[PDB]
From a paper:
Recently, a unique binding site for a cyclic 12-residue peptide was discovered within a cavity formed by the light and heavy chains of the cetuximab Fab domain. Here, multiple crystal structures of meditope peptides incorporating different cyclization strategies bound to the central cavity of the cetuximab Fab domain are presented. Collectively, the structural and kinetic data presented here indicate that small perturbations introduced by different cyclization strategies can significantly affect the affinity of the meditope–Fab complex.
Given the loss in affinity for the linear peptide, we turned our attention to whether the extension of the cyclic meditope would affect the interaction and whether these alterations would affect the overall affinity. Firstly, we synthesized a modified variant of the meditope termed the ‘long meditope’, with an N-terminal acetylcysteine and an extension at the C-terminus to partially mimic the N-terminally displayed phage peptide [(AcN)CQFDLSTRRLRCGGSK]. N-terminal acetylation also allows future modifications of the peptide (lysine amine). The crystal structure did not reveal significant differences between the long meditope and the original meditope (r.m.s.d. of 0.1 Å for the Cα atoms of residues 2–11), with the exception of the cyclization region (cysteines 1 and 12; the r.m.s.d. calculated over 12 Cα atoms increased to 0.9 Å), which are in the buried conformation. The remainder of the peptide, GGSK, C-terminal to Cys12 was largely disordered and could not be modeled. In comparison, the respective distances for the long meditope are much shorter (3.2–3.6 Å for Cα and SG of the cysteines, CD and CG of Ile10 and CG of Val9).
Numbering used by the authors:
A (entry chain B): 1 to 220
B (entry chain E): 1 to 12
C (entry chain A): 1 to 212
Write the structure that this text describes.
Amino acid sequence: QVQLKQSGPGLVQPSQSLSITCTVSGFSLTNYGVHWVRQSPGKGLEWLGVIWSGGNTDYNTPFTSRLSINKDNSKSQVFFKMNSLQSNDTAIYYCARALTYYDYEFAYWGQGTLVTVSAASTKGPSVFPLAPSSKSTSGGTAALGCLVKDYFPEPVTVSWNSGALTSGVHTFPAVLQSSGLYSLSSVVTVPSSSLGTQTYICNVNHKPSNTKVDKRVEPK
Amino acid sequence: XQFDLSTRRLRC
Amino acid sequence: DILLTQSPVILSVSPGERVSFSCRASQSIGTNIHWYQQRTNGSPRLLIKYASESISGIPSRFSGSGSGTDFTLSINSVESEDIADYYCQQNNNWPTTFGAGTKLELKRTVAAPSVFIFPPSDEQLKSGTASVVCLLNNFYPREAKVQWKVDNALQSGNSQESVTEQDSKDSTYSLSSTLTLSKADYEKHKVYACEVTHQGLSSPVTKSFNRG
Ligand SMILES: *[C@@H]1O[C@H](CO)[C@@H](O)[C@H](O)[C@H]1NC(C)=O
């Protein structure tokens, strides 16, 4: 099938440059143009530019001076680069493909790349268990989770049992602490009878800091 | 409304 | 550029009902408008192209109409899976532009939260910080009160809340309240209590524990 896979999220300093790679499959870059769209809290969805199948590029006028898009047809990769980033350039960046080679109706999207523009440093999270107990077990249902604390920047992916456990899972939106670091909890409800036989592990991946942690959560 | 980068949803 | 205005900002309906989204343009753009859906943590999903033309893989309940400056996206029978934001896009003029979006919320029957409390881990205490987590699980509506008391002393300012987006399956919310204090302070107190107030509760629910 048609897929667009983007490079991971990360931190970019003010006045520095941003680079994102878009690897595509299910079609050839010699047949289709690839567009770049961003989504920010201030300006919402914003079309940035496009690299056409022939090699020609168009940039939205406010970005023409600091945008450049390249590609390697053989490697099926498209390269996005934007100079002199400022704080309101903090956004999710998408690469996308249209239905036809010339049009602008975006039928296929990349997973997005959250780019944060700050002067701070990247920091991995510590992961602490939220142990199930009587204080969290009612009607045969036990609750347990993981505390993902003190990281920067967003995002952090949390899964349970390597993806095998999805129902009952709640990964709360991160909150910004006074320290300027994010913190969140991910919880899941399970049968209390499975606490003795099933292992429960939250899989934490903070891509910006390359921090991967598997945390086993047990009753205390 | 304001777009939330964390949840990819609108926060009103 | 072409300014697209989406109205209203928020939209709250009940399952099975029909709902319409409005997208108005600053000047005529013919039928050159596309619609998108954004679910939680997702990328946009093309729903309708060119005002009314349908898209493969998109449920029949999604339709569109309009020409000139007034356009309408419709869902004839809303499901819980439809909880998302909806954006319009014009491409009659360069560069292509998007509207600000409309948030679709669903109504459901009142559901009282299940309340669980988590004392800080011994692992976290090794760092010199204590986090007490109070979980309010699967409730509707969103409004809820969480009161923290440590040794009968009302806590204020030292806790943070986070609320999930609406669940696509049962349309509920979950809430976390995290009381954070130093390891020193945590060891100087005994009773930690979390008191929950919600419409679905005939009485406030208190979850608590004694340190040790
Ligand atoms: C950020 O600030 C610049 C000026 O430095 C302004 O032109 C622009 O509107 C802002 N960008 C966004 C996307 O909010």
